[PDB]
Amino acid sequence: DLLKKEYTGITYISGPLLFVENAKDLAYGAIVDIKDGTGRVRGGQVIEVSEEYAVIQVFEETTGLDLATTSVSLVEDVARLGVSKEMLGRRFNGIGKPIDGLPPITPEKRLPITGLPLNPVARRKPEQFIQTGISTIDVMNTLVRGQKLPIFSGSGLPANEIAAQIARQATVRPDLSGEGEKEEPFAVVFAAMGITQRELSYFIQEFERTGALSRSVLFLNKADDPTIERILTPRMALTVAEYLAFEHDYHVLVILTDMTNYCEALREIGAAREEIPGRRGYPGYMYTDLATIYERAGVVEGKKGSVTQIPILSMPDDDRTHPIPDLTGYITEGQIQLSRELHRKGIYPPIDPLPSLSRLMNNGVGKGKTREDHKQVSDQLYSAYANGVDIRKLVAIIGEDALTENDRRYLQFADAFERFFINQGQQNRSIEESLQIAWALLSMLPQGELKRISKDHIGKYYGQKLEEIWG
Amino acid sequence: LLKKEYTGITYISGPLLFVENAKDLAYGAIVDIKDGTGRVRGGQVIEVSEEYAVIQVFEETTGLDLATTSVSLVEDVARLGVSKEMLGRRFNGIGKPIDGLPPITPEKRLPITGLPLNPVARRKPEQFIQTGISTIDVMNTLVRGQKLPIFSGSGLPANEIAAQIARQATVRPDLSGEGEKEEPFAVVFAAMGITQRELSYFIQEFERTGALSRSVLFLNKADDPTIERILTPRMALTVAEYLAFEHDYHVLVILTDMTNYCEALREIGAAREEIPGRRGYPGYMYTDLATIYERAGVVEGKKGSVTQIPILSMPDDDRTHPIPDLTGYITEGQIQLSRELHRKGIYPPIDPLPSLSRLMNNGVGKGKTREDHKQVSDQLYSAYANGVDIRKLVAIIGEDALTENDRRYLQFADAFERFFINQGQQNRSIEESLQIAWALLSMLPQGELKRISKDHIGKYYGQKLEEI
Amino acid sequence: MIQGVIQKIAGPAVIAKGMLGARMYDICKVGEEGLVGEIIRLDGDTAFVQVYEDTSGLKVGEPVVSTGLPLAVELGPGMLNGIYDGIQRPLERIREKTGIYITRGVVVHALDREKKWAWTPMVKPGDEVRGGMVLGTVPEFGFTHKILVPPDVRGRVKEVKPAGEYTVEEPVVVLEDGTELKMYHTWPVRRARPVQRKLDPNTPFLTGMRILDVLFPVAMGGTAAIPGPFGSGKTVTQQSLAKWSNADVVVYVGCGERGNEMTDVLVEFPELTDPKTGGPLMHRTVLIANTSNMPVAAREASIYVGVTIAEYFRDQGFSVALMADSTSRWAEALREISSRLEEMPAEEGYPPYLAARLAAFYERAGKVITLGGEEGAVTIVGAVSPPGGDMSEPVTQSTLRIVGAFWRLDASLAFRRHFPAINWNGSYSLFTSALDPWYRENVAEDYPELRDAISELLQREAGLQEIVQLVGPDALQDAERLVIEVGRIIREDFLQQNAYHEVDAYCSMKKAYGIMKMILAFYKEAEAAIKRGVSIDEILQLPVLERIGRARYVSEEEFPAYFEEAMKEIQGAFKALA
Amino acid sequence: RRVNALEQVVIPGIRAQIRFIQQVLEQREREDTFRLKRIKGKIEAREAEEE
Numbered sequence A: 001d002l003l004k005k006e007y008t009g010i011t012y013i014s015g016p017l018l019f020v021e022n023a024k025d026l027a028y029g030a031i032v033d034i035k036d037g038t039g040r041v042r043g044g045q046v047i048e049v050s051e052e053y054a055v056i057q058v059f060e061e062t063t064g065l066d067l068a069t070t071s072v073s074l075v076e077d078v079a080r081l082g083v084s085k086e087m088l089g090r091r092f093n094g095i096g097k098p099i100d101g102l103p104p105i106t107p108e109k110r111l112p113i114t115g116l117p118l119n120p121v122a123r124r125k126p127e128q129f130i131q132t133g134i135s136t137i138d139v140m141n142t143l144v145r146g147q148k149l150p151i152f153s154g155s156g157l158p159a160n161e162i163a164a165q166i167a168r169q170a171t172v173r174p175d176l177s178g179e180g181e182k183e184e185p186f187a188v189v190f191a192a193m194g195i196t197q198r199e200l201s202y203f204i205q206e207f208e209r210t211g212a213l214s215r216s217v218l219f220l221n222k223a224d225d226p227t228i229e230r231i232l233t234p235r236m237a238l239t240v241a242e243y244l245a246f247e248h249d250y251h252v253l254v255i256l257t258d259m260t261n262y263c264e265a266l267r268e269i270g271a272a273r274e275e276i277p278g279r280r281g282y283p284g285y286m287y288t289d290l291a292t293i294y295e296r297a298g299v300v301e302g303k304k305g306s307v308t309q310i311p312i313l314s315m316p317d318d319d320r321t322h323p324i325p326d327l328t329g330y331i332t333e334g335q336i337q338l339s340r341e342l343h344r345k346g347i348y349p350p351i352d353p354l355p356s357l358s359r360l361m362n363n364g365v366g367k368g369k370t371r372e373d374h375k376q377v378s379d380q381l382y383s384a385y386a387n388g389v390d391i392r393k394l395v396a397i398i399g400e401d402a403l404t405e406n407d408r409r410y411l412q413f414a415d416a417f418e419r420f421f422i423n424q425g426q427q428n429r430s431i432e433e434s435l436q437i438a439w440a441l442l443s444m445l446p447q448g449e450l451k452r453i454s455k456d457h458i459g460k461y462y463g464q465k466l467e468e469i470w471g
Numbered sequence B: 001l002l003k004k005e006y007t008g009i010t011y012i013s014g015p016l017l018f019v020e021n022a023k024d025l026a027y028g029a030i031v032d033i034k035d036g037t038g039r040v041r042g043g044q045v046i047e048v049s050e051e052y053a054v055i056q057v058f059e060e061t062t063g064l065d066l067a068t069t070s071v072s073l074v075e076d077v078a079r080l081g082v083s084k085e086m087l088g089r090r091f092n093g094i095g096k097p098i099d100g101l102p103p104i105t106p107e108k109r110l111p112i113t114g115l116p117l118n119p120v121a122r123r124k125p126e127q128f129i130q131t132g133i134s135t136i137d138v139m140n141t142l143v144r145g146q147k148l149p150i151f152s153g154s155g156l157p158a159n160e161i162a163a164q165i166a167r168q169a170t171v172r173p174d175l176s177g178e179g180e181k182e183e184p185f186a187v188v189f190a191a192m193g194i195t196q197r198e199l200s201y202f203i204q205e206f207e208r209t210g211a212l213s214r215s216v217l218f219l220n221k222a223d224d225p226t227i228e229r230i231l232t233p234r235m236a237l238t239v240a241e242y243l244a245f246e247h248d249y250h251v252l253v254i255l256t257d258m259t260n261y262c263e264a265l266r267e268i269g270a271a272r273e274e275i276p277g278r279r280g281y282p283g284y285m286y287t288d289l290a291t292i293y294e295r296a297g298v299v300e301g302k303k304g305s306v307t308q309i310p311i312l313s314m315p316d317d318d319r320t321h322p323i324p325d326l327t328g329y330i331t332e333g334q335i336q337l338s339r340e341l342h343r344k345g346i347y348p349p350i351d352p353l354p355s356l357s358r359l360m361n362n363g364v365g366k367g368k369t370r371e372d373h374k375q376v377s378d379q380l381y382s383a384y385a386n387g388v389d390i391r392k393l394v395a396i397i398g399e400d401a402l403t404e405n406d407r408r409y410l411q412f413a414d415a416f417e418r419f420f421i422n423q424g425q426q427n428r429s430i431e432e433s434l435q436i437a438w439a440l441l442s443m444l445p446q447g448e449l450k451r452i453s454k455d456h457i458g459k460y461y462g463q464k465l466e467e468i
Numbered sequence C: 001m002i003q004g005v006i007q008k009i010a011g012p013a014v015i016a017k018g019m020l021g022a023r024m025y026d027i028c029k030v031g032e033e034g035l036v037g038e039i040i041r042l043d044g045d046t047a048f049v050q051v052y053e054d055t056s057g058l059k060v061g062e063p064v065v066s067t068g069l070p071l072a073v074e075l076g077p078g079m080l081n082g083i084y085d086g087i088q089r090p091l092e093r094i095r096e097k098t099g100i101y102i103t104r105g106v107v108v109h110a111l112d113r114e115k116k117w118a119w120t121p122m123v124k125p126g127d128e129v130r131g132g133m134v135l136g137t138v139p140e141f142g143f144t145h146k147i148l149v150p151p152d153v154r155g156r157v158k159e160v161k162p163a164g165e166y167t168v169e170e171p172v173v174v175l176e177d178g179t180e181l182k183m184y185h186t187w188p189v190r191r192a193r194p195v196q197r198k199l200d201p202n203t204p205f206l207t208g209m210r211i212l213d214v215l216f217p218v219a220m221g222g223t224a225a226i227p228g229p230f231g232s233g234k235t236v237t238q239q240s241l242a243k244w245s246n247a248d249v250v251v252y253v254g255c256g257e258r259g260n261e262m263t264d265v266l267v268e269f270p271e272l273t274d275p276k277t278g279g280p281l282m283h284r285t286v287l288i289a290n291t292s293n294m295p296v297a298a299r300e301a302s303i304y305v306g307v308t309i310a311e312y313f314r315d316q317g318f319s320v321a322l323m324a325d326s327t328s329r330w331a332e333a334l335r336e337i338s339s340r341l342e343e344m345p346a347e348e349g350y351p352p353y354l355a356a357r358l359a360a361f362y363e364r365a366g367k368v369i370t371l372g373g374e375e376g377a378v379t380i381v382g383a384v385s386p387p388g389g390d391m392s393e394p395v396t397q398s399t400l401r402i403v404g405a406f407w408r409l410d411a412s413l414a415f416r417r418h419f420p421a422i423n424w425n426g427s428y429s430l431f432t433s434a435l436d437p438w439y440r441e442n443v444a445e446d447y448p449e450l451r452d453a454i455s456e457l458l459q460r461e462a463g464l465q466e467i468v469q470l471v472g473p474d475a476l477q478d479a480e481r482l483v484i485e486v487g488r489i490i491r492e493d494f495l496q497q498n499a500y501h502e503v504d505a506y507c508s509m510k511k512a513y514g515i516m517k518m519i520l521a522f523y524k525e526a527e528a529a530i531k532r533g534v535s536i537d538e539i540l541q542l543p544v545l546e547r548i549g550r551a552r553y554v555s556e557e558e559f560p561a562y563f564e565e566a567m568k569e570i571q572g573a574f575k576a577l578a
Numbered sequence D: 001r002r003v004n005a006l007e008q009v010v011i012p013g014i015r016a017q018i019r020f021i022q023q024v025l026e027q028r029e030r031e032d033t034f035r036l037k038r039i040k041g042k043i044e045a046r047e048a049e050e051e
């Protein structure tokens, strides 16, 4: 038409919802603009429709709205975001508007933010090993390109510093696999849900220090921003990441700051609609909603791009059985779990190796990729550490003097393992140095009890002294 | 004044009943209900609308029908008539006399919900009260205008300690220097959910002591309706506030069992289908309890005072139950009894470690009790806590590892319990109690006694336990 | 205006009809009595109003009038040295009017309209002014109160009142378009006040308590939470911070607590002395009181009023400290209001939007550059009183995700009277790293090293205590016995502090530094003496232990001489012994 | 010594944990009962009253 239609029959405003009764023309899932009587425009999304009435959720706050003057206008039927290659180095808010003072982006394409599932035929196996520079991740919980590897954190634990260090130090090793020329740097897409000024300032300073803002795209949604806007931020971030990776052959690394806040907003919307709850408070469909976010990563046959995700989430009472960590561990391809007890002893990074897991480790290790002894060394380290922890629990009861020689050896191995292997500070370690330290630690035990390593590898590498590396 | 009747009753369901066209019933009013047999029930209005009003009945709804039941009007604010002739009388939980004497003549009528006190109109509690119990008087002292409950278990003698506090309560004006002159003292006693045997015990004790002339008793037995339990403490507090802030009395209020009050509150809330709280209790229990406890205190420019001593029973022994937990957030301390001391025969079985009095610092010091009261109390607390820890260590490990100092701490702990806490029916003064406390501190080396001065001991030294 | 009548009453919730045209979150006048209410729902021709006062005695058919404006406060001269109700009503005027009981329906002005203030102009006619600029100064109790343009105002000025005495409601500046600017302006309490930039906190917030200043610092412009069961010491800690901290203006919010805790502050504070100006302490303090037996719905308003006033004093260039007595009562108020609306609740009956409110409240704190160009900061310390005494209740968990420091109290330490009863094992602080450049230049160059040594000693004592409990203290070797005794000396003499002692209540940074130096020097000497073969009892019988124990009771003036004497005594005693 | 340690320290802690877990589970069952009541009331309202 020459001028667009407006709907005025609004009789309900309560919380985030809003009912309009003359709106059968609005498509399900459409985006609308809510006009105040003073001229202010607020956005909203339609999730119900009938010949009787329609239900609209509001992104911004509902202060100042009235039932006599408010009107609803129509934007396009599908939530679409305009993307371009020119948007590298820009900053955006939670809904995609610029906040850096620069003119807006002229779109090359406009894409639906909900995305589409990847065809399981069109995928391929993640293979490339990524050297993060942290021994407890490189050796025992290896990260490969194309993996979803969330970080399970507490309240006072430093997950942000670990994420920044990984993003700074991450690189591939073409020389080990023989793939030829060195890579190009990762492109970082940073999506922030409800985040304090302290964490945001730290992240901005860290990215400015290394010059990574020229490659990055930032979607920011602060703690004082409206809550319902957090629904759209991960979807827009992943739309941009998918476009860059699969249309321009970039290697994209995506960081999601706190999935807990996203789940809180989701619970707010679900409880407003009287949905059937899940276990504690959260709606019953939360598994499906999280699955549409995580499962957008991976690699695609016949294309050079890749998408890697590092979500960060906080287990509330350090509880692994909470619904959010449970569903995340069901969907993702592993987890890195931080330990508070190691943090209290001054160990950084405080990664607890036993609850940690990497599902796609076996694709990226072995001969011709890193080295031939990687997997057996990892297994032996795991078994020895478990024995050390069990002997700790034993000497908590019976006392140190009652120990034999074997239990004392395992106990000393566990202590030295923590102090030297885990505690590394801000230093950067290559894979060879980490393997050398791991072999030096295993040399504290007799050859008889390490049954998980083949005798050739023992004959080749066993016998190193730790004093040469640390003295 | 002329009355009004509504006969449009078409709903009855448990405790609630609806009125068809009661447009002029004020919210929170009181109504009386009359059925076909002439029996009269009471009810309170908690709803109103253009189409119906909701009334919950103060008792059972048996015998009501939609054809003959009519609802009348009583005054829209729950009010109680008070006078000075209430002294020496007995009433039920609704205010009717149960002594058989003619009803009082009301001087004034006051709302039973009260009004919030302006914090500008308050003043700091400053007058110490000597009760004769050494654990209370020295370590957890009681000030006029304080709400200090007693935390009891099941099967512990809380009522006996309450009666002993009621008899032995006295102020010490000679220490303040003003000299001894008379002050009007009175006791308001409110018992809710009380059985016949303990009722007879209370009545007999009060008649034997001779304090029935100066007392007012509100009684509520276990067979009464559950609304009278709710309305019982409010009427007692209204009477206490009237007496103290109009006739300048010094009133002491004792509430027999708040556990029954909370259980009655849970029964009422659950019948109206509202969201529950931490343990089945309603989510507004904190505010409801705060409207009761916060009526005590003192007022600037008025000679009267109100003092509250609630008694409650913990479910087994546990803290963190909703009743003692929410009580501890409102009141200004607690006196907690110990089952271990009662088992071995020590009376009164007050445990000093969890006991607390927040307003003690305002009522002690030079010119109030003594120059050394606070430091003595702190040293006793630290030494007793260390002795208890060492005793746990002994019970786990054995007597072998002890030095002489730890044996000194054990002897201190045993002596402190046996002499200080056990007093039977004595009426100990403050000064002899401080002398006994200094005698206990003489067991420890003088070097360990930090944060004190030695002129305090310099004129009261060398005493043993003279009672033995 | 919009006018309608009432048809439903249930507790503090009133439903009005005929209100077509009312806006969300406005302010309404309810009934013949004229109560104050706020609209949070709209449905057809009806509106849902929560009432900030008592609703007893109301009837169907009483009129409701809408003011068309949200809940706002009056910001201007005259707020200092004052005590206010939960919706900014002066309590002493209410006392003068009604008496000793707070009845409903009393209408008072927030600022005194009849006091004369001295006015000194700054601007000239023809000048261009913007939001947040300074135009004029007014003398207050020691301070200089600046008159600020409201943030949403731009224009040119040609009218200035000359220097004289005027009330707060006289136009002192008239803009070109005809806008008249007075000494005060109003701001809605739910909107955050604008700023230019936010800065990283880099200077400490000195509290005067040894354990909080040394081990778990909080920076100027940060946030902190202090949970604990009843009887742990939250209120005493907050009042000590109000007495002794170096903030310019202290705002104290009492949200659903005892009335005696506010009467004590009202009575005692005018007799004390301001640490940094010398005047009465009450001249820098603003009190907002809403006790437990006052109406429930007014608890939220008190919190928002307090944070709005603290934000206002920030824009003048001051440094403001805000203390909230309890946020659990605010959570209970939200639970009650949602229960009246019949919304589906989250865990323990709290509404699902509970965490968003806490996030929005704590986000107001920070060190900023004001619109006028000055630098201000607001720091927030909020006490959590979990009725579900365990630390897994929703309020505590939602608080821990935004705060920067976490001071955890223990009921076990409060039973044995070990105040402040801070659990040093479970507590943490995230501001330690940023304050080190300030510590090195303002206190001493080796201060972080001593702090690390103290923490190491505490950790080793913590392990050896479990060893002792499982075995016994006799089976320990001499080194472990020395570690246990030094840890006990630390816990008794350094960490512990009495807030009612005349001298011990306040401790400078250099006094804590001296005590730490004494403890570590003793530990080093005793460690060297064990190598010589001396008995452990000969160390413990030394008279120098008494000197360290009494050290915290020494006054600030006498302390350096005491410290030097004690160091000489330590050296001589450990030289001559054995 | 072993018997005394087991009788004093371990058993009361286990018993306290058991009763705490029982109380939490009871609270969760009560809350879901309330939710079921509300949804039944909602279901029965919309089926009869609407015309």
Ligand SMILES: Nc1ncnc2c1ncn2[C@@H]1O[C@H](COP(=O)(O)OP(=O)(O)OP(=O)(O)O)[C@@H](O)[C@H]1O
Residues within 6 Å of the ligand: B328, B329, B330, B357, B358, B359, C228, C229, C230, C231, C232, C233, C234, C235, C236, C237, C385, C419, C420, C497, C498, C499, C500
């Ligand atoms: N630092 C301290 N120095 C001396 N005494 C203290 C100290 N901290 C607490 N106390 C004592 O313990 C009491 C604790 O009372 P306080 O009001 O501080 O507790 P709270 O944890 O805030 O409780 P509530 O939840 O009831 O408000 C004080 O009244 C005082 O007697």
Ligand SMILES: [Mg+2]
Residues within 6 Å of the ligand: C234, C235, C236
């Ligand atoms: Mg307190």
